[PDB]
Amino acid sequence: EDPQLLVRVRGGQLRGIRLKAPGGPVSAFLGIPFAEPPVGSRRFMPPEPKRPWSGVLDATTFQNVCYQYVDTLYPGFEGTEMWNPNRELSEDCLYLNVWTPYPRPASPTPVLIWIYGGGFYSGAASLDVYDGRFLAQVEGAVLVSMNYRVGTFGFLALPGSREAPGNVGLLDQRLALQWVQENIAAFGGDPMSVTLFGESAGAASVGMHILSLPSRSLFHRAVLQSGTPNGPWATVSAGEARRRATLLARLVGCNDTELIACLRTRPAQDLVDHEWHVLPQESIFRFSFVPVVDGDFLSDTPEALINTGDFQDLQVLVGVVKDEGSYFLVYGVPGFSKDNESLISRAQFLAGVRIGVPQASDLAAEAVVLHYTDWLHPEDPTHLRDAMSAVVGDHNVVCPVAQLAGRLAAQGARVYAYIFEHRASTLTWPLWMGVPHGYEIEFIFGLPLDPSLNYTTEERIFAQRLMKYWTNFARTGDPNDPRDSKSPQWPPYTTAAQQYVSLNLKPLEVRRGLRAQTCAFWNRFLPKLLSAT
Template sequence: MTGQGVRLVLLSITLSVAVAQRTVIETTTGKVRGKVLNLYGRQVVAFLGIPYAEPPIGPLRFKPPQPAKNWTSVFDAFKYGNSCYQIKDTLFPNFTGSEAWNANTPLSEDCLKINVWMPNPPPADKTVMVWIYGGGFWYGTASLDYYDGKTIAAIENVVVVSMNYRVGSLGFLALGHPDAPGNMGLMDQNLALQWVQKNIAFFGGDPQKVTILGESAGSVSVGYHLLSMKSRSLFSRAIMQSGAPNCPWAFITNKEALRRGKAFARAVECPTTVPLAQTIECLRSKPADYIIANEWVTSDPIFRFPHVPVIDGTFITEDPKTSIRRGNFKKCSLLAGAVKDEGTFFLIYGAPGFSKQTESLISRSQFLEGVKMSVPETNSFGVDAIAFQYTDWLKENDGVSNRDALDDVVGDHNVICPLNDFAHAYASFGQAVYKYSFEQRASNLVWPKWMGTPHGYEIEFQFGLPLEPKRNYTRDEANFSRRMMRNWANFARTG
């Protein structure tokens, strides 16, 4: 072998060792080893399933999270952690449209893990984007294909983070007691954001350039972090997609939370006429799968969920509408928006006359019944006023017109109007607010065409799924996805 050949081999070995060394990062709790990914002519190191909290099991069930303890050996962060215990959507068996949102890793209470995607070689002082998933606070997981951070990390040269947080009763049971205060899922997110502040510099991120973003309940969560004094110092900017804390499904009173909590306790055969500490002790003794199988204790209709945020006196200290009106929120730039057809995804889950197997051409009477179901807190006068406002009186009995009108009722009431109110409040207090409306329907979307661009279906574009040839998007969609990633990353970089 020539001297030049030896030098080339040594150089190759040196580079390989250097790359391997970069995959091990020392965090404040221990060393983690990531996996190198080669994509689009670049490298990203994925660190998946890093513990950021102690498992909330046994006496820690229903309690605020505790920081993870230190470990001594290198933690192999090669795969996603467990998904937090949750119900799965089984209404449409073997249908990818709904099942793609179901948890895709084993269910466990030992689920409080964080994921980081780092450009390689490691950057310095790079923008950080922290994703919070949605799911109505009753399901969701950071490991879904939709939320894979590798592509945007590679294309936009940013550090991407996501975390799992508790959902359902295990994350939001609120009994007005220190052992079950409510909002545990939000506190999980807060602890993950604290982890980011302490550790993200080790991954090349700048803790002073952290943007939090989320969709649906994830967007609501972003809003609560903007409102909560506990979170305001942990990030710099925010992106809210299809949700806000003032949405009618995103908050319940303490009285209603206690009513639901006791109904839930009775459903799992725990006493409710004894001191709350005894009720909670009984609830802790029940298997997690039994807990989640019995947690849906409400019969609320469209776009309502059983266990959601409350005023706990620590993380949330007042009604979110009051905070918004008073300007009691973090002052920062905000990007907010929604998709074109926010209501259709929820209409097929119980609105009269709606089905994914048909065109859902509903009658006038079905439209009126749907309006009543969609605004359960409104009296008959309010229902009549809403029906009047949304009726096309030249097409009063037209099935398409009635169907599309009910989509607008559900979308406006539950997403668009509250989010607009939140954004307008921000602007009125002098903050930079950017609004968007997302109307791109993916060419390979499996939901029926009448559903348009449904709730949640901007996410695949912002995370770059159309760039993957195996997913059968068009070239135009890939280019559109690149533009969306650039816009979101540019906002995170500069506001």
Template sequence: MATQCLLILAGCICTAMAIGAGSKPHFNSSSASSTPHSTIGGGSSPNTNPGKLDYHDDPLVVETQSGLVRGSARVVLGKEVHIFTGIPFAKPPVGPLRFRRPVPVEPWHGVLDATALPNSCYQERYEYFKGFEGEEMWNPNTNVSEDCLYLNIWVPQRVRLRHSGERPKVPILVWIYGGGYMSGTSTLDVYDADIVVATSDIIVASMQYRVGSFGFLYLKPFFGPDSEEAPGNMGMWDQALAIRWLKDNAAAFGGDPDLITLFGESAGGGSVSLHLMSPITKGLVRRGIMQSGTLNAPWSYMTGEKAADIGRVLVEDVGCNSTQLSEAPSKVMACLRSVDSKAISVKQWNSYWGILGFPSAPTIDGVFLPKHPMDLIKELDWEDTEILIGSNQDEGTYFILYDFMDYFEKDSPTFLQRDKYLDIVNLIFKNMTRLERDAIIFQYTDWEHLADGYKNQRMIADVVGDYFFICPTNVFAEQFAEHGTKVYYYYFTQRTSLNLWGQWMGVMHGDEIEYVFGHPLNMSIDYNDNERDLSLRIMEIYSRFALTGKPIANEADWPTYTKDHPKYYILNSDTYGTGKGPRTTNCAFWNDFLPKLANHPDPDYACASGVAETANLGVNSATSCLLVGPKHLLYFVTIVLARLLLSL
């Protein structure tokens, strides 16, 4: 089994070669001198006198509260787009600021050259399929560095012109990338928003935030509640500071500070949902778009106890003394700050605990995430909040490929024998009881085609996709709707004609992103007309939602999502309309039946073979299993009846 290659949301990650320190954008001044971004963190600035120069006639210069920035212009689909990349919003989190919350950037003098993509935050690379573009597209395309807290902004020129005439300002969509809170960067080609702003009256922004232990190391229980060292959720504070910077400077770019909508995929979607709930950011935004990721998913948050234990392991693994955590925290932090970035980036994976068991995630810290996400949903006021949320048809295929490479191949389907199917399910849910695992296997078995190995492969993908993504998304949508939020649900089912992954992988996790960012409209890429139309439709949905809180003009065509009426809107070039669910039966199993089963464990459950190991649920095998204990009969009857009821 591929234990060293670990799949990240919207990608995968392997132990890889070190990446060198990154080059940095610079400041321009009247004397053409330049100073690297890192000097901002120290409070120094270029030796210039901008008062001698008149920048007001330069359409590519914007005056922000932090200082002047100069962007670049690009003509896209016949429209001029102004692009500002690498704007610092925080001091570089290096040296004494490593493992601390971000500190706002100090104002600079001169004009910041915002024309180069910023560093990506420190992370490892995907290199399991070397040279394969389907994997390489998720790798950082700029140098990785701990000096990485920068943001990017795309503005239509027509908005800048209108803004100069004091016309109404436009909504801002703020993108938060995914990557399992372990990887990702806003600089990826697939996140380039120039086509979005060329086709819509909207501004798009994105930010870098720290990932992995650099962004989520949690040692607060050892250091005390008042300590500023390794408080956890630093990556979320990075995002929050960037959102605040954008709100404070929205008007300078022609944007409306009261119309900020967050959108993100996977861990980005989980981040969006957290910002809507957190007392730190709840008032900054009113709308959120969550693509294949919500904060209640098993991978998307962790308790303080678990995070602290992972932190303790990292301290020990990088060569610092974990026994000093409570007695000499300053020594521990001094040691941690002396450790090479690469060592931390690699060693943190020692705490990976299985498929989608990432060692970094938003932590219930009592501050940014005060309590369990579902408890927050029930307690807060959501009347002024609107949510657009959704899932993809085949969320699980990425993850079973990378975590079970001994069983699956990238390019072709696998005939998965029944015993291998059972092995994988039992491994994925090894922390559940035998009773729960047998129930999962019963639910995800095609009993009429037990010998069909291709169906077994399909079932494994569905187990992972449903449990980790689709069903948590459904619950999240239901709970928000129940507590006063307008929720709109989409279900993305488009298999792209240019998809580089094997056909068996279907409509994968992250496949919608290229449509959201308008890439099918790039005529240099051979998408078909139907795909271009779908991309235009999705971009219109997003821009309308950001402006009005409704994804389409006619609400009858896309009704709000509720528990009693779980209607979703189909995103597919060949299909228009709504459906119910998605995955109604399987999600009823995960969200309703299995929790009840878990709350009523059966100590007498000791069948020698068990439902999970029975190749055929015939009378003899079932009877021999039922003879083990009287409670087993009740379990068997209950699960069969539940299966029948769920299928009605």
């Protein structure tokens, strides 16, 4: 019995496991209940705090993954399976994990809270790419990660109802955040320096905590990687959640109370089986059950909230990877695949646009096409393929990111922006996909430091740099290395200068304007074009 692996939290005692990191040991406290299991009559309901327990609770192993869809497009291919559930699926899934240095820190240590993505339909804090041991051992960080309910279980809403109020998967997150405030000092964490970080849906979730007042007393800084609360995919209107929830109910054979009661009688896979049948159009980068603009957790649309918000004493780090949209093309757009170069025709490019921008009228999709076509090389298959990925990435990530960055900067936040441009040497997806969505995470988490993983020594050095920016950001709100001099410095992003930096194997480079001309199309013109059909 190691005194270092025993912790008394408010609910009772816990026993961790000493793990081996390349540099030395870390303590991990995995599978901690932070809520009552949301099972039975608690399906679709806000989480309740976990009742205290007798004895010493075994926190040496990851808990179950929230009930979700398992990917089937490329069975047994690492590039897809690396995101698939790596534990048993259960609705009993509300647990969090804590890594700390060993011995546990002498003084209060900045806390990093990770919120996974997965389109609000998938994910788990147990995936190898979210391994907290490196950040804990190398940087001295206390690292936290929670499971939150995904899919229908997290986001099925009948707005204004008592029994499916919507946004419960975000309340799961808020609860883990509260758990950290109350409990993290016992692990050596500083609850007075908490930084949220997340990628994709995790980043939009982080963005919703910025925009929801009750969340604001539970963190100090935020990192949003490749996702935003604003934009076309991260929320739905109250009317449209109602539509999709009552559609799913028809599909499984089911007065709000009557309807919800019947949905609660349904086996979990029954919900998942029909989860994708409720989207209004054939689309990609669009998810059925997502946070709803309820007038509660979200008092207005994210767009409204970022336009009028006051972000006085907030610091934010945001960025994108080089090829945000490539990954999504293989899952819906005819002519695209990982098993070849995916060289498309003009006709397939026009069809792909109607799927990547499903909300577009004829005129608006034509404006997209006429903008993304290279008029010197209009029928060139390589250009057309790359433009298709660009449409998807710009519309869904880069331009929302640029819109958020600018509003936050203008409204008194401190913002730092990046583009991640290094393609993992170990990447299993083909070259044409470039640096796809999700593929910065392994570097930020420090995975190249594990020698058995086969990364180059250059990528190990680059990981160490990224871990430093991210933890310097957590410590100080400024990602710059206070010991390093000539770097060059990473400047804050502003609406005037519009400076962001390239994260790649070369030293930092400062660039201005994150797709400025193209994003003006998406953020300024396109709305005016749709709102007159």
